Design a protein around this nucleic acid. Structure first.
Ligand SMILES: Nc1nc2c(ncn2[C@@H]2O[C@H](COP(=O)(O)OP(=O)(O)OP(=O)(O)O)[C@@H](O)[C@H]2O)c(=O)[nH]1
Ligand SMILES: [Mg+2]
Ligand SMILES: [Zn+2]
Ligand SMILES: [Zn+2]
Lengths: 197, 148, 49, 343, 199, 50, 65, 348, 103
RNA sequence: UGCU
């Protein structure tokens, strides 16, 4: 039984995949006039470049639905229009655009701009930071070539590929490249005859 | 007296390019004594102005009339007789540019001082004889008082 | 295709090499006719927040 | 004029069509020339006042005039997080055959509030899982579901087919420790709602567990939060720039909340006026009508906060606020003592 | 139909990027494996691993592309002069005329520390100094400014105000930047070029 | 996956980890956060000196 | 699986009202008026009770028993 | 003796993204231990790694030699690799949620009181910035009400203390610069900073972004070294979020909904375009159509239709930009250049 | 160990002081900030958080003249305590009279 | 087979 923590991936049914950046307390989460605090705060800078007006329409429809005790339909090339949900909001007493007067929880002063609140259907993905976290000590090696294994399940180490070697060469860290590719990976001492080679 | 300039101006336009900013407006004004033009950013929320408004404006080096140029730090809490008591709208800026007129290719005698009052631009243009005392990288006080 | 949620009513007796379940799954508020047809509302894979 | 503009900026918070203005607290010395905003305990005590408008079981509403947004948010956050209460922490299971997972069951039990008075207990020291009579409460839960010996032939309903098939929180039995039975009278230590559905069982399954609850604050975990919704909002004050009459009055009544704008016939014609701005929620629906935009002026009072606190039923909201203020005073006293010890 | 066309365009872009990834990966691999042998020596000559010289001087001048302030140029003389004038304002020194500016520039450039500098950079400095001096001359001819320093309106000197201290500071800063922006021996210039052509 | 490309030019090393990233503006541009779990595993050989 | 006891956003006790909401559904009350009578003013609890799916009985139908 | 000590603060550590295009994809940073389970770093360094915090798995290596450690810290230093060797443009600069923050802060409408100014200035006084004076700048307007401007609050970042020798100077144009104001643009899009004091202009991607030269951080790096630029970037990253969260910035359906005049103009433009397309189709099918040079009649018709559609698109976008009011979040973001553009705005 | 003091530099200047407070949050920070900002003898006052992971805050106080910046801190603490006591008494009296007039 |  795992709890959502920093690093867990989440989706919002609109391809707006994100990762848990911070977990701020409820007292730190803003609050509206009714006292509702948001569970998830997403970045608005992702809307301009992606043109995800469908997410805003879904949020408004869900707000209207939870207010009027109904289930709006987001059918493709149809569904509930924006005017119906705006009428529902103005009838229930909320803003017809989703934006509501919200007060800052940290400073306790109202914000200069209204916040866009609403119920969104977020779904958690199987990508877990607890499973993706890896740290490789010396550990075992392979029989053929004495180097760390590949997979994490078999306790494998990371690979400094050709691109990493090229980056190190461009930087010019000769001793770093040597310690990486020779000392800490496949260091060994052989005996060579100076007569026959 | 550290008064570097003083003149009565009359507003001729409020927003030639439209209502860009809610709190700040770009007023264009012309002096009556001389041909001094002033393109100044003013805060209308705290100091409202109109089109046919006339105001006396004084740009001084220091805020104290006694001549003490000790302006290392300003303490708003301190109460003492100063020049701000005789005016209504006081700003603190720095003369950040002095540019001559480029319209007159020859025999030019007009200059223009651009001051930045914390971002608010003030271009005071006119004869150089009136801009005497204005120097670059010099902090000054502007005092505006509307008249009847 | 990777969303986390319930698989079926026999998910407790089912024993797979790897399974992910949700504690308090909730059906979407904005559900589509395709959702109603496939009966995904009965086995949702997310929560409305 | 300029004086009116300054007064508005310092007293009211105007909400525009696109954004809110005058949201920052500026009543401080040095910010205003014609105003001496220096701290004055006398003026503060004179202007400050509290008026309760509604107070019922697990619900309180009171207007505070004279307090600032900083202290308002401080009280709100203290009530939300820094009020200690009792909540199930440790769960010892004994042959739980329920379909619900053990961890999910423990989490649900921890989310159940306890009606015990937290002031009579103390915080458990680091470790000491055994618990002491002073800082621990024990709740036993033993439910064995079985088939009903007497039922109908069909008995399609589980209510008639089985007995104790829904393990409600009322089955919890408080087991006293030491002299707790003598200290607390019977009926005091019990679940708050007594109707929370924990889980559902089937014949053959059994849930046997013991819950050890200790004192804790809401900052550590949300299960200790006594207040379900403790918030505050600035008092609205709607003002009309010019007298609006006619069908415009009904338009204003329909745009604003039904209980803030009232229409009256003073001379046979309908004229609208503000009756009670408390019920208004500032839906900002008046901005839709083009003509009625320049006739009203929505505003919030900066020194008037309506606090609404709906609790879960652990202790009344007045005592909750009292304990919040006491915790703040204790923090202040601790910091003063630390400073004195430093100097 | 519009949604279908948009999906077609999106999938076209996706497959284009997918092919581009592998194509550029292969190209970068080849370029790096080909250019990983060159390096900047101490004698300002780029040579391969076998000792053969590929260039007698990197880029013809020997400047660091990473330390390039201007558009393929070492410094932006206008910006540097403005920064110097703003950082070191001398109110106790008079302004300089065209002749005085040229004289002080010629006297300061003929020092020893300026001999080791490249000739092109010195010629560019001379050209910029001549341009600014001509600008000052035009301004003074327009506004009747006298080079003697006895003009009654002292504000006229604030149009184009320059002092020998600022001139020396500007020259020293330009020289230091040009000396520090040179190719440092030992850098994997070939690998840097490969990466900057691959990305 | 050959000896020249798979075992000489690019090879696997130890004392390294792989983890998901998350934003944190409270740290400097030249600083990076490392979890305690990976720190307890990745060790550094320090020589005892005066 | 089962109705949560606490609400995610606010935290009001809502698990004890699940059987009451089911009774209101069996009755002639609609979703809106049922949630209004249950005392849920804010929309968070309304959503919590409306978007919840009852799978505990579906799992008990497969339970060993 | 040798001791295998745990990874503690101050240790140099290599941080890389598996897909590497340029050398800046891997850099040597200083490790700081935290209780979480993820690799965190300043978001200003995401452009080099080309990361987006959407599930990317990055690699972290620990050198096992003092010489390798020193070489990684010196050559692969983040403060020393603030610019790419391709063309010298700075990659480690402001990013989304910072450009917009700085823009909204330096807007001419910003007027903060003493309390808010002091709070915003203290929001950065952490770490090495705890041993320096605040140097509260004088207020601009003081007689009606003492208000500190966001441009001064931002210049406090460039010059936090008195003993700081940083004197930033810059004079450049913005993205929405008209072209004739010459530091008097009606939109105030001419960036002018003197002695680490923002005299005019509003910050945007053109000055704080990683687009090209003329960046304030680039000037700081090239004038006063790497440490000053790093400290300025840290102060910006620590200040912009606090002010942005205290002000509030959200987007809604009302920020993209069209207007009545916009719909009317769109309808008229679509009607005109369809009429012209039908006229061209008729002229091509029945009769002779003007054939453009270097192409056949079918390609000429194709080019004419594409030109008409592009004209319709441009006119609709211009109408939407003219009808949209200020304070709009998409419009402000497209102006400051943090994310999005007028093309995307008109499309959506 | 809860609240510790720090001078602005090695010179040990009392005009500017930094108080680091442990196991605290924005509540007490903002409360003390508001209660001490009204002191006419304070040039600058600002509270900040080091990192959301650790529970600690840092307040910075720069006075006008030669004030040690510790007496303003104590004044703010005492004023906050007095305001808390006053609001507590007022709320208690309000609840009492409300119950009286309701019953 | 998924992930970036
Ligand atoms: N999970 C997983 N499944 C794989 C993987 N590789 C192959 N498969 C299965 O094999 C099919 C395609 O793999 P191929 O690339 O044909 O296998 P391959 O060509 O040998 O790949 P190489 O081993 O890299 O040559 C897929 O459609 C999968 O059915 C893998 O790496 N991971
Ligand atoms: Mg990604
Ligand atoms: Zn041999
Ligand atoms: Zn709720």
């Amino acid at each position: 039984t795992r709890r959502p923590e920093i690093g867990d991936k989440f989706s919002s049914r609109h391809g707006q995949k994100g990762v848990c950046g911070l977990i701020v307390p409820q007292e730190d989460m803003p609050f509206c006039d009714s006292g509702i605090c948001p569970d998830i705060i997403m970045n608005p800078h992702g809307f301009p470049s992606r043109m995800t007006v469908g997410k805003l329409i879904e949020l408004l429809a869900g707000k209207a639905g939870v207010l009027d005790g109904r289930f709006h339909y987001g059918t493709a090339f149809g569904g509930s229009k924006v005017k119906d949900v705006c009428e529902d909001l103005v009838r229930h007493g909320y803003n017809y655009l989703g934006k509501d007067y919200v007060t800052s929880g940290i400073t306790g002063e109202p914000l200069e701009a209204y916040i866009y609140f609403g119920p969104v259907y977020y779904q958690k993905l199987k990508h877990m930071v607890l499973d993706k976290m890896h740290a490789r000590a010396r550990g075992p090696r392979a029989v053929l070539t004495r180097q760390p294994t590949e997979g994490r399940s078999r306790d494998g180490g990371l690979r400094l590929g050709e691109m990493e070697r090229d980056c190190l060469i461009g930087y010019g860290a000769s001793m770093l490249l040597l310690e990486r590719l020779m000392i800490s990976s496949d260091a060994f001492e052989v005996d060579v005859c100076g007569q026959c080679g | 007296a550290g008064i570097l300039f003083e003149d009565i101006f009359d507003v001729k336009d409020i927003d030639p390019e439209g209502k860009k900013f809610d709190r700040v407006s770009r007023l264009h004004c012309e002096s009556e004594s001389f041909k001094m033009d002033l393109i100044l950013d003013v805060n209308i929320q705290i100091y409202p102005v109109d089109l046919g408004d006339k105001f006396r404006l004084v740009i001084a080096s220091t805020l104290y009339e006694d001549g003490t140029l000790d302006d290392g730090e300003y303490n708003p809490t301190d109460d003492r007789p100063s020049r701000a008591d005789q005016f209504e709208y006081v700003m603190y800026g720095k003369v950040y540019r002095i540019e001559g007129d480029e319209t007159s290719t020859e025999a030019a005698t007009r200059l223009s001082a651009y001051v930045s009052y914390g971002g608010l631009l003030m271009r005071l243009q006119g004869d150089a004889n009136n801009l005497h005392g204005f120097e670059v990288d010099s902090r000054v006080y502007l005092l505006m008082k509307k008249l009847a | 295709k990777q969303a986390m949620g319930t698989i079926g009513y026999n998910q407790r007796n089912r024993i797979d090499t790897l399974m992910y379940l949700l504690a308090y799954p909730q059906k979407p508020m904005v559900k589509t006719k395709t959702i109603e047809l496939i009966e995904f509302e009965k086995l949702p894979a997310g929560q409305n927040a | 004029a300029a004086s009116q503009a300054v007064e508005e900026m310092r007293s009211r918070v105007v909400l525009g069509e696109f954004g809110v203005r005058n949201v920052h607290t500026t009543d401080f010395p040095g910010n205003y020339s014609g105003y001496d905003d220096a701290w004055d305990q006398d003026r503060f005590e004179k202007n400050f006042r509290v008026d309760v408008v509604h107070m019922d079981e697990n619900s309180l509403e009171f207007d505070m005039v004279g307090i600032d947004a900083a202290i308002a948010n401080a009280f709100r956050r203290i009530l939300l997080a820094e009020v200690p209460t009792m909540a199930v922490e440790k769960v010892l299971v004994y042959n739980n055959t329920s379909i619900v997972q053990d961890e999910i069951l423990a989490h649900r039990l921890g989310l159940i509030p306890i009606h015990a008075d937290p002031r009579l207990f103390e915080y458990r020291n680091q470790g000491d899982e055994e618990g002491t009579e002073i800082d621990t409460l024990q709740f036993r839960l033993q439910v064995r579901c079985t088939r009903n010996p007497h039922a109908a032939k069909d008995s399609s309903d589980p209510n008639e087919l089985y007995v104790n098939h829904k393990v409600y929180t009322r089955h919890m039995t408080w087991i006293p420790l030491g002299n707790q039975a003598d200290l607390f009278p019977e009926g005091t230590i019990r679940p708050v709602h007594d109707d929370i559905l924990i889980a559902q069982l089937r014949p053959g399954q059994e849930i046997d567990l013991l819950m050890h609850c200790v004192k804790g604050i809401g900052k550590d975990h949300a299960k200790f939060s006594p207040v379900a919704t403790a918030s505050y909002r600035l008092l609205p004050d709607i003002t009309l720039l010019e007298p609006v009459e006619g069908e415009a009055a009904e338009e204003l009544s329909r745009c604003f909340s039904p209980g803030v704008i009232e229409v009256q016939e003073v001379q046979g014609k309908k004229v609208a006026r503000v009756a009670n701005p408390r019920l208004d929620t500032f839906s900002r629906e008046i901005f839709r009508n083009e003509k009625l935009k320049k006739v009203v002026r929505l505003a919030r009072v900066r020194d008037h906060y309506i606090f609404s606190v709906e609790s879960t039923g652990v202790l009344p909201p007045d005592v909750l606020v009292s304990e919040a203020i006491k915790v703040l005073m204790g923090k202040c006293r601790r910091f003063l003592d630390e400073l004195d010890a430093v100097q | 139909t519009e949604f279908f066309f948009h999906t077609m365009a999106g999938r076209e872009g996706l497959v284009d990027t997918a092919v581009k990834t592998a194509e550029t990966g292969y190209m970068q691999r080849r370029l790096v494996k080909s250019l990983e042998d060159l390096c900047s020596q101490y004698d300002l000559t780029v040579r391969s691993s076998t000792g053969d010289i590929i260039q007698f001087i990197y880029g013809g001048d020997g400047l660091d592309p990473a330390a390039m302030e201007g558009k393929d140029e070492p410094l932006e003389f206008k910006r540097v002069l403005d920064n110097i004038k703003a950082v070191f304002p001398c109110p106790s020194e008079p302004a300089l005329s065209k002749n005085e500016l040229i004289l002080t520039t010629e006297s300061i450039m003929k020092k020893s520390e300026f001999l080791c500098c490249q000739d092109s950079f010195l010629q560019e400095i001379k050209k910029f100094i001549k341009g600014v001096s001509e600008k000052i001359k035009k301004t003074r001819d327009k506004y009747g400014i006298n080079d003697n320093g006895t003009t009654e309106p002292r504000v006229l000197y604030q149009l184009d105000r320059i002092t020998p201290t600022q001139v020396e500071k500007f020259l020293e800063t330009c020289r230091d930047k040009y000396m520090r922006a040179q190719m440092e021996p030992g850098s994997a210039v070939g690998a840097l070029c490969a990466q900057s052509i691959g990305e | 996956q050959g000896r020249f490309r798979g075992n000489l030019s690019g090879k696997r090393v130890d004392f390294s980890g792989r983890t998901v990233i998350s934003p944190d503006p409270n740290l400097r541009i030249d600083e990076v956060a490392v979890p305690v779990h990976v720190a307890k595993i990745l060790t550094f050989p320090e020589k005892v000196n005066k | 699986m089962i109705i949560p006891v606490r609400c995610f956003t606010c935290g009001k006790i809502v698990g004890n009202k699940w059987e009451a909401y089911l009774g209101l559904l069996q009755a002639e009350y609609t979703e809106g008026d049922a949630l209004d009578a249950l005392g849920l003013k804010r929309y968070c609890c309304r959503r919590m009770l409306l978007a919840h799916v009852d799978l505990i009985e579906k799992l008990l139908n497969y339970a060993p028993l | 003796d040798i001791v295998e000590r745990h990874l503690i603060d101050g240790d140099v550590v290599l941080f890389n993204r598996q897909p590497s295009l340029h050398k800046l994809s891997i850099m040597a940073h200083l490790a700081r231990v935290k209780p979480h389970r993820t690799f965190r770093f300043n978001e200003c360094v995401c452009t080099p790694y080309n990361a987006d915090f959407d599930g990317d798995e990055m690699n972290l290596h620990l050198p096992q030699t003092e010489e390798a450690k020193a070489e990684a810290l010196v050559l692969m230093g983040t403060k020393a690799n603030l610019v790419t060797p391709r063309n010298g443009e700075p990659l480690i600069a402001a990013i989304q949620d910072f450009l917009t923050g700085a823009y909204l802060l330096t807007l001419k409408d910003t007027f903060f009181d003493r309390a808010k100014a002091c709070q915003i200035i203290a929001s950065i006084l952490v770490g090495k910035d705890e041993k320096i004076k605040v140097r509260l700048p004088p207020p601009t307007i003081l007689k009606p009400v003492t208000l500190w401007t966001g441009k001064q609050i931002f210049s406090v970042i460039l010059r936090p203390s008195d003993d700081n020798p940083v004197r930033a100077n810059l004079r450049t144009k913005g993205k929405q610069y008209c072209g004739k104001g010459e530091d008097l643009c009606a939109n105030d899009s001419y960036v002018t900073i003197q002695n680490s004091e923002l005299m005019s202009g509003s910050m945007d991607k053109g000055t704080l972004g990683s687009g090209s030269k003329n960046n304030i951080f680039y000037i700081l790096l090239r004038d006063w070294g790497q440490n000053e630029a790093a400290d300025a970037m840290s102060r910006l990253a620590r200040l912009a979020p606090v002010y942005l969260s205290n002000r509030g910035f959200s987007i809604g359906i009302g920020d993209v909904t069209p207007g009545q005049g916009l719909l009317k103009a769109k309808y008229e433009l679509l009607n005109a375009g369809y009429k012209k397309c039908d006229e061209y189709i008729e002229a091509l099918n029945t009769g002779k159509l003007q054939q453009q040079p270097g192409c056949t009649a079918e390609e000429t018709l194709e080019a004419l239709i594409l030109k008409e559609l592009s004209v319709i698109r441009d006119h609709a976008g211009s109408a939407c930009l003219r009808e949209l009011d200020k304070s709009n979040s998409p419009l402000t973001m497209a102006l400051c250049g943090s994310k999005g553009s007028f093309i995307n705005i008109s499309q959506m | 160990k809860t609240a510790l003091e720090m001078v602005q530099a090695a010179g040990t200047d009392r005009h500017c002081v930094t108080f680091v407070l442990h196991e605290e949050d924005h509540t007490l920070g903002n409360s003390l900030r508001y209660m001490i900002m009204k002191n006419p003898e304070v040039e600058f006052c600002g509270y900040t958080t080091t990192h959301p992971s650790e529970s600690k805050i840092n307040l910075r106080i720069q006075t006008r003249g030669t004030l040690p910046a510790v007496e303003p801190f104590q004044r703010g603490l005492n004023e906050l305590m007095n305001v808390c006591q006053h609001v507590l008494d007022k709320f208690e009296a309000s609840i009492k009279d409300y119950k009286d007039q309701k019953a």
